[PDB]
Design a protein around this ligand. Structure first.
Ligand SMILES: CCOP(=O)(Cc1ccc(C)cc1)OCC
Ligand SMILES: CCOP(=O)(Cc1ccc(C)cc1)OCC
Ligand SMILES: [Co+2]
Ligand SMILES: [Co+2]
Ligand SMILES: [Co+2]
Ligand SMILES: [Co+2]
Ligand code: NA
Ligand code: NA
Lengths: 336, 336
């Protein structure tokens, strides 16, 4: 395989692979909908309040050593690259933007062909997002159980954009339903290397069979929702449905399990946090903030030490939080 | 009833009622999706190409006497008020912007309560769209058959915003399924006066009984799709499903029919045209432009003269295209 220039696109421009440092690979500054943050900022108090909250959070995460986060917010998660650039500069944390489509594509996207979609993903990666010149450094896709016809098109366009640019693909999955397998099937049918793909939300399930089967094939396993837990909130139906009833320690243990299985090179870890969240019930943000006051700092502050205690070597945790993300994000073309 | 200032909000600011003049009440500069025009302008060639096309089309309609158009593009139809302002100034045609929600609300909108929706509509009307200070002069809603639970919330929020601001409500209906009746019932249950409402796409039906009974209750009847016809495109399934097989003459005669039943004051006429269209199959804009090369000028150039030869008095046509839209758009509050 070959590289395209050894640089990773961030919202402040290209950085070298070494500059990425400690990287959280699945995060969000704001989980919203296309055009929403700009049409109704007051839903988050104000765009300023949101920016200010995000800067505090990024600064707290940075104090714990996070130097880079991958904001996997696609067009339909309401990604506002201008907001990302502003908070990245104010907090001095590298932010890698995404292209791709999540599970709320509007009609103008749902009626598109795979060829059309491939050109939109390529546009965001090569030309840049909107008119900002900010190029996407990752392609985000998703399935909530068996892929629907439109989602298959998205996965295929994702694989094509990745094969042409070298930018990796990262996925949302209904991990319990083993979505990662079908996703991998499609990706491979397009000729994409598994090393270019992270099967996300993999800690949303406890089947090590599933996870180790994927890692053996060469995929990156995204254990990205470690702090998500509604334990103690059984009285809240909406928060329970979203966060699940498994402990953060249960999720964290899958990281050690994969390490013991021998797949430390294939693990990517994250919080899947955000500072604003309009695509769910009102006030979900407050509920989650009570659940995990540490926000994106959760991984370094709670998870890394938990694993070290459970016996995982510090050398290994560095490999996971620094080396793996560096290899994943470096634009890499398949050998011609 | 009461006025709130006797001025109509346009994208270039307020205009007196007599400045509105000849007004097309249901049109679009671009029928898209939230954030789409800004994220993928190349889908329309370029933002600049799209804008030049709209200016040309607006100038042609202006040449025929059109002084104002109501762009009923909602947040989810991808309304880009900056684009409206730019072409309004360049073509020197007043454009009234809309708030409300059509049938592609994203998750951040679909999960909102009637109270929350009401605040968003009031925001766009009072404070302005996004951060532009451009205030909505009309509220757009829609159903396509029986109202879904979300759509009932949208209708009620629209009635509450209209009651508070005086701005009228205009609707998209599956006219042949008589949606007008359920919309009316919901609007009247909120205390909205029928005179603040236009039941749109009414010319999509041939059921004069249904139309007259609504007119009788004081509703305005939008015969806004006059040039929509796929006659001669019987081999084009997508175009046929969108435009129908009824001729423009058949649609237009509904204007005469309503006049004959004695409801000239209740009629509003339009083309429901656009210059960019991404929320449907690719290249649909090209098929429509071939169908109706006159575009928005179709009403003044073909329809007004046709009615004239069918015996409708010139003065009655002036009342419909000038007086009725003026009365409709004047923000009007219910009596204290
Ligand atoms: C390899 C030495 O770690 P590092 O380079 C990056 C790093 C910091 C904190 C944690 C929890 C993991 C990784 O130290 C910061 C300057
Ligand atoms: C008395 C009304 O005419 P009007 O004010 C507006 C008007 C112009 C053209 C058509 C087809 C209808 C109405 O004439 C333009 C200066
Ligand atoms: Co997800
Ligand atoms: Co996420
Ligand atoms: Co419509
Ligand atoms: Co329309
Ligand atoms: Na690039
Ligand atoms: Na107003």
């Amino acid at each position: 395989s070959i590289g395209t220039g050894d640089r990773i696109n961030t919202v402040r421009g290209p950085i070298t692979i070494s500059e990425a440092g400690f990287t959280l690979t699945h995060e969000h500054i704001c989980g919203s909908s296309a055009g929403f943050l700009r049409a109704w900022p007051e839903f988050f108090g104000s765009r300023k309040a949101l920016a200010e909250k995000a800067v505090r959070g990024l600064r707290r995460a940075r104090a714990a050593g996070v130097r880079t986060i991958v904001d996997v917010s696609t067009f339909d998660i309401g990604r506002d690259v201008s907001l990302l650039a502003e908070v990245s500069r104010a907090a001095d944390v590298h932010i890698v933007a995404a292209t791709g489509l999540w599970f709320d594509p509007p009609l103008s996207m749902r009626l598109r062909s795979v060829e059309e979609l491939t050109q939109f993903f390529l546009r965001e990666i090569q030309y840049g997002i909107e008119d900002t010149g900010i190029r996407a450094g990752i392609i985000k896709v998703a399935t909530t159980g068996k892929a629907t016809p439109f989602q298959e098109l998205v996965l295929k366009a994702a694989a094509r954009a990745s094969l042409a640019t070298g930018v990796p693909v990262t996925t949302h999955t209904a991990a319990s339903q083993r979505d990662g397998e079908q996703q991998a099937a499609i990706f491979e049918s397009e000729g994409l290397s598994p090393s270019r793909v992270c099967i996300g939300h993999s800690d949303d399930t406890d089947d090590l069979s599933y996870l180790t089967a994927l890692a053996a094939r060469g995929y990156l396993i995204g254990l990205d929702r470690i702090p998500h837990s509604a334990i103690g909130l059984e009285d809240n139906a909406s928060a329970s449905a979203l966060l699940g009833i498994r402990s953060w320690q249960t999720r964290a243990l899958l990281i050690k399990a994969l390490i013991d299985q021998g797949y430390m090179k294939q693990i990517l870890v994250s919080n899947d946090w955000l500072f604003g969240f309009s695509s769910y019930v009102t006030n979900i943000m407050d509920v989650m903030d009570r659940v995990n006051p540490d926000g994106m700092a959760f991984i370094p502050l709670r998870v890394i030490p938990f694993l070290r205690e459970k016996g995982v070597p510090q050398e290994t945790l560095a490999g996971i939080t620094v080396t793996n993300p560096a290899r994943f994000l470096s634009p890499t073309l398949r050998a011609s």
